[PDB]
């Protein structure tokens, strides 16, 4: 059993915790309880190989923005999450991307771009704009709903595959 260290990052309120709890417990969290730092474990078979996912769920509120280097050092792959009805959260993605690259001193960090809340009709970030950004990073783009489970396994398990092939 290989162990994988995944880290979920992105602006406050985009659904990092809801995505993680949906993956771990098959439950959608309606409350908005801002995270400081939480961690979860999940044994799961991916492409026929059993592994153990360690998932770090991080703080998106700006008041915690000076405490990120410590978790970026330990992570092996990053889910970069924005919400498709929140343009500012999309504009915040590049700041996370650049900080991860700096901390890990690498242009080649496993990452997946995640556009969450895709169950909501009132989209303000178009798929094409997010896909263009993902291509510029060399990473896949996956739209998700923590509420319906759409895309959730795909997002996390795609990240595992990119760590595996790293």
């Amino acid at each position: 059993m290989t162990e994988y260290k995944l880290v979920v990052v992105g602006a406050g309120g985009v659904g990092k915790s809801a995505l993680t709890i949906q993956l771990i417990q098959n439950h959608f969290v309606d409350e908005y309880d801002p995270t400081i730092e939480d961690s979860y474990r999940k044994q799961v078979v991916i492409d026929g190989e059993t592994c153990l996912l360690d998932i770090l769920d991080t703080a998106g509120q700006e008041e915690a923005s000076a405490m990120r280097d410590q978790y970026m050092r330990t992570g092996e792959g990053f889910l970069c999450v924005f919400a498709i009805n929140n343009t500012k959260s999309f504009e915040d993605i590049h700041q996370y991307r650049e900080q991860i690259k700096r901390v890990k001193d690498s242009d080649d960090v496993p990452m997946v771009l995640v556009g969450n809340k895709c169950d909501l009709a009132a989209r303000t970030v178009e798929s094409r704009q997010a896909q263009d950004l993902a291509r510029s990073y060399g990473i896949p783009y996956i739209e998700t709903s923590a509420k319906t489970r759409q895309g959730v396994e795909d997002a996390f398990y795609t990240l595992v595959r990119e760590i595996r092939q790293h």
């Binding site: 059993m1 417990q25 959608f28 044994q43 405490m67 410590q70 050092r73």
Partner: protein, 469 residues
């Protein structure tokens, strides 16, 4: 340079690390031992977060620190003094200018705010995942509410207001799937006819499914508070470990029910059908990763009354002997193959709890509470980490729900199963063994014949599921 710290005289958590107060194991450090002050410092350290450590500490700390004292210590940790103006700040103020306050601003951003946020994260985890401390001590809850409710200043405000709401919700205190659960299966007993429910009349697939839902729920209900301190073995076990004991008593009752079904079927041909049906239920348990259920069956087959029934075992089909043998081999060599299989499958599963209990008990009995170093007694934290590795493994398998539909009548049937009746354990297990001797006497006594007891067909419907449109 490193930030300067408050004087250790006014703030105890600024004392330098030494082997008289903290010992590390041989890229964050791992703590072997330390004083409670040093443990709390590293629990809320300014340089890094350690969420595993938070879980480990909150799961195990009561063996070395009382809940009331922990709260006092983290409040003390939170109240960090700010440094005085520096010489450059002084000279600016003397000229009527605003000081740069560079050292003060850095200390706020890189020491006070991270430590305070990490203290709040301890409080948040304490309330969310270890709320029993507050259920059992209402004054502790009042103190926590007062502390959180009086934190001032905007940097912590979002988390203070959130934690206040979380506490209030915990005081007065839904699943979604990738697919639909399979259709409930029926055999001789039809829906609603609970009076005919029995081992051979319910569908063996649905027996295994409903027992797996029941045993998964029982597994998922056990909290670490029922395990730390080995409290399920002590005199107050019924008070401190009720969910664990309910889970074990279900397992014991099902094993005894299997044995009773076997030995009370005196006709040889019927008893072969009973044993074969139980092995089919075991096959579905294996398919569902219900290892508790697997061992429930294996324990029954290895029991003194059943294991000796050579005439019955002789007629069990070879493919079913192989299923039972594979299941028995999971337990051999101190559960070597079981442990490997548990770590290889795709959850949901229902682990066998007994191995966890033995490992927690032996870890707590086999390691000292303190280490003596340089005349000081340090808390042996490595021992607590080992216990929390086990409780963490337990919790990891409690997360995944089964995609199976409850059948309320079949569920009630197995919840109310009571093979022992009003009999005490010795009286009942002696009865089972004497029944075994009656139906297959010791050699050289001849094998008697017995009349049939079942009026319905004995042929199994099998354990492959069906699917109408």
């Amino acid at each position: 340079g490193q930030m300067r710290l408050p004087s250790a005289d006014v703030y105890r958590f600024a004392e330098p690390d030494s082997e008289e107060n903290i010992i590390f194991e041989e890229g964050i450090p791992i703590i072997k031992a330390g004083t409670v002050i040093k443990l709390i410092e590293r629990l809320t350290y300014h340089m890094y977060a350690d969420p595993n450590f938070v879980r480990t500490f909150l799961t195990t700390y009561r063996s070395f620190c009382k809940p009331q004292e922990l709260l006092s210590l983290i409040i003390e940790r939170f109240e960090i003094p700010e440094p005085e103006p520096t010489e450059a700040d002084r000279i600016a103020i003397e000229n009527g200018d605003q000081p740069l306050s560079a050292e003060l601003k850095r200390f706020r951003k890189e020491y006070i705010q991270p430590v305070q946020l990490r203290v709040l994260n301890v409080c948040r985890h304490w309330v969310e995942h270890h709320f029993y401390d507050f259920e059992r001590d209402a004054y502790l809850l009042q103190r926590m509410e007062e502390f959180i409710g009086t934190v001032r200043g905007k940097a912590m405000k979002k988390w203070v207001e959130s934690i206040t709401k979380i506490i209030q919700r915990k005081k007065i205190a839904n699943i979604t799937f990738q697919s639909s659960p399979p259709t409930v299966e029926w055999h001789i007993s039809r829906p609603g006819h609970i009076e005919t429910f029995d081992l051979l009349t319910l569908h063996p697939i649905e027996i295994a499914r409903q027992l797996t839902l029941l045993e998964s729920d029982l597994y998922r209900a056990v909290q670490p508070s029922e395990l730390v301190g080995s409290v399920w073995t002590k005199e107050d076990k019924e008070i401190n470990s009720p969910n664990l004991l309910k889970m074990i008593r279900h397992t014991t009752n099902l094993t005894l029910w299997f044995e009773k079904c076997i030995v009370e079927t005196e006709n040889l041909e019927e008893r072969v059908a009973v044993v074969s049906r139980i092995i089919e239920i075991l096959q579905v348990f294996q398919e569902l990763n219900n290892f508790n259920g697997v061992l429930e069956v294996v324990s029954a087959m290895n029991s003194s009354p059943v294991y000796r029934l050579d005439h019955t075992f002789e007629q069990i089909p070879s493919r079913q002997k192989k299923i039972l043998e594979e299941a028995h081999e999971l337990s051999e060599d101190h559960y070597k193959k079981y442990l490997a299989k548990l770590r290889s499958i795709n959850p949901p599963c229902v682990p066998f709890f007994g191995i966890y209990l033995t490992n927690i008990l032996k870890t707590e009995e086999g390691n000292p509470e303190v280490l003596k170093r340089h005349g000081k007694e340090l808390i042996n934290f490595s021992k607590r980490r080992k216990v929390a590795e086990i409780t963490g493994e337990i919790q990891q398998y409690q997360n995944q729900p089964y995609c199976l539909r409850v059948e309320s009548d079949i569920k009630r049937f197995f919840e109310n199963l009571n093979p022992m009746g009003n009999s005490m354990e010795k009286e009942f297990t002696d009865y089972l063994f004497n029944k075994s001797l009656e139906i297959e006497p010791r050699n050289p006594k001849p094998l008697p014949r017995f009349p049939k007891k079942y009026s319905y067909p004995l042929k199994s419907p099998g354990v492959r599921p069906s699917n109408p449109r």
